[PDB]
Design a protein around this ligand. Structure first.
Ligand SMILES: [Cl-]
Length: 130
């Protein structure tokens, strides 16, 4: 229905705002663009499901997220990809892991404070209906 389309539109507006807020944070600059294979030729061979905030915006605009649950799975991928590709004790890897965990924690904290649980439940019920 048009009411269900309105619901998903509101979801996309909400997710674009959350994503924008993460992307303008200087801590999260490394997560804003795909890894350039030049710098990191082994990336695409180790990480099977690359994810970055530009890819998340693209997915929002392609109507790929019908729930906040599905969006947070891609935020979790940004975090787990960084924990897997950068696992060493050296400060460069520790800095990326801390920034990845902070992205993930920030996204979850914004959603906890600003997402209505009944709006998420409605999205989940429309998604399951199809
Ligand atoms: Cl830096």
């Amino acid at each position: 229905s048009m009411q269900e389309e309105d619901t998903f539109r509101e979801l996309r507006i909400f997710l674009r705002n959350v994503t924008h807020r993460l992307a303008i944070d200087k801590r999260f600059r490394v997560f804003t663009k795909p890894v350039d294979p030049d710098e990191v030729p082994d990336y695409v061979t180790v990480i099977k499901q690359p994810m970055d905030l530009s890819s998340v915006i693209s997915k929002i605009d392609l109507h790929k997220y019908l729930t906040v649950k599905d969006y947070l799975r891609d935020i979790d991928l940004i975090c787990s990809n960084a924990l897997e590709y950068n696992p060493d004790r050296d400060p460069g890897d520790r800095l990326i892991r801390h920034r990845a965990c902070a992205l993930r924690d920030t996204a979850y904290a914004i959603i906890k404070e600003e997402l209505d649980e009944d709006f998420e439940q409605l999205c989940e019920e429309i998604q399951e209906s199809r």
